[PDB]
Copies of this chain bind each other. A is one copy, B any other.
Amino acid sequence: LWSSHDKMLAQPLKDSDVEVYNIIKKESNRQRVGLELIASENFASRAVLEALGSCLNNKYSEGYPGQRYYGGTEFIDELETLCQKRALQAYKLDPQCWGVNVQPYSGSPANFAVYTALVEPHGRIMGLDLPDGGHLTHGFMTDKKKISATSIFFESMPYKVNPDTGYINYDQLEENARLFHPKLIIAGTSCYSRNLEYARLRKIADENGAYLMADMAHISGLVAAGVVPSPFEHCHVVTTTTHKTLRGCRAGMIFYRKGVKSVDPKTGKEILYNLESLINSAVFPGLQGGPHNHAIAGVAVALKQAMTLEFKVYQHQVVANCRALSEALTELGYKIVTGGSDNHLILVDLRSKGTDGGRAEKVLEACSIACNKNTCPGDRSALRPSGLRLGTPALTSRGLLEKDFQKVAHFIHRGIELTLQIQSDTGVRATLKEFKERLAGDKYQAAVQALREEVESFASLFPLPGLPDF
């Protein structure tokens, strides 16, 4: 009846479902007294959380503003226009010579859409390899079979970097591009701790009449603050994610050039760009249908908050804390790839000690500390990584400082010593299973318990931003 219907769709989750409520409570309690060092995570603001749970979920609309398939979408069109304006003004771009689109759901759909729109199906692709700081959506083909969709539906030839210097090689890149004849140059970055020469990439792309593509998903806030040079001056298409350093919901953005490309030497006809129409026809209904209106408000609020001086101060503090942490780690006796790191994520190398990344990451996880393992440029033993990638994208937002980061570095050093002790006790010839079994030792259990208790007591002082009342 009417009374039973009210208590069904208008009842809080605290008493309706106690399983999901307890799960969320436990997750919040774990993330409140735990230190996170993942270079691809960050806490969102309360405004984004409130905008995500708005009433926009009960609105299924299709089409772009002006040619909507359904009716009564005036507010949706206004919100989309406001979001596009905020996205175009956040990076200080010209609306007449640039375009933005927030229709894709995440980074993968946006990349697949831009591909299907400009990759020329059954063509050739050229991007950075995966082990030398590259993404999976940038081509991953093996000798036996392919895994990534881009490698299954298209042909891609990745290039490696110098294992000694550590920088991306550019001399052989031009020859490989001239001998391969590609149609799109990808410069994705996943673990690279240095910058890239966009001028040479644009020159190589123009030499063969191809296009240049670069994704700023890993470096999104620094580009808006002014710490990292903006790549909107040499690339044709730019994609990014708003769930890394932008402090927003999971969404995708696509930037393209709109205007004249070249001039005709015969008479002088201006060749207009043919990327906006292709991207629009491929993102919808070429790949997906009805977009997510609940994330538009969140991404708009995030883009608006990123324009304030607080965002710039936060980015400056992030880079300062990153430099301090790198210097502290190098002072203890650890080797860092390329010396330092201009970005926030660093690539720590542990090959000098002889311990792989698997056991180190497992122990660091056991001591209530997050981290991600990766391979080093020129690693012979591909089965056991020797790199422990770190990042501080969310620690600064809680209140971490120089002394706090120094204490965290000391804790990491203690964990490394514990890993070395466990490895020497179990032997080097042993496999990973032996290390996992030896980790449960009485002495090792007491040591990891004391370490986790100390790190929890030290991290419990900093607050946890999020949604109150629970």
Contacts and interface: CB of A to CB of B under 8 A. Distances in A.
Interface residues of A, number: 130
A147 B44 CA distance: 37
Contacts of A47: 11-13, 16-17
A444 interface: no
A157 interface: yes
A141 interface: yes
Contacts of A54: 24, 28, 49, 466-467, 470
Contacts of A382: none
A375 B200 CA distance: 30
Output the residue of A4, A109, A209 with the most chain B CB within 10 A.
A109
A11 B112 CA distance: 36
A43 interface: yes
B112 A287 contact: yes
Contacts of A78: 23
Contacts of A59: 27, 31, 41
Contacts of A300: 17, 20
A87 to B, nearest CB: 14
Contacts of A79: 20, 23
A164 to B, nearest CB: 15
A435 to B, nearest CB: 14
Contacts of A157: 157, 179-180
Contact of A6 (B6, B31, B399): B399
Oligomer: number of copies:
4
Contact of A72 (B12, B305, B370): B370
Contacts of A285: 136, 147-148
Contacts of A310: 4-5, 8-9
Output the residue of A12, A112, A149 with the most chain B CB within 10 A.
A149
Interface of A: 1-2, 4-6, 8-13, 16-17, 19-20, 23-24, 26-28, 30-31, 34, 36, 38, 40-60, 69-72, 75-76, 78-79, 82, 105-109, 112, 116, 121-122, 124, 136-137, 141-143, 147-149, 152-153, 155, 157-160, 172, 175-176, 179-181, 208-209, 243, 247, 249-250, 281-282, 285-290, 292, 294, 297, 300-301, 304-305, 308, 310, 313-314, 317, 361-362, 364-366, 368, 370-372, 394, 397, 399, 463, 465-468, 470
Given A9-B44, A49-B53, A136-B285, 9 more contacts: A2-B399, A9-B45, A30-B75, A60-B243, A72-B370, A124-B155, A148-B286, A149-B282, A160-B179
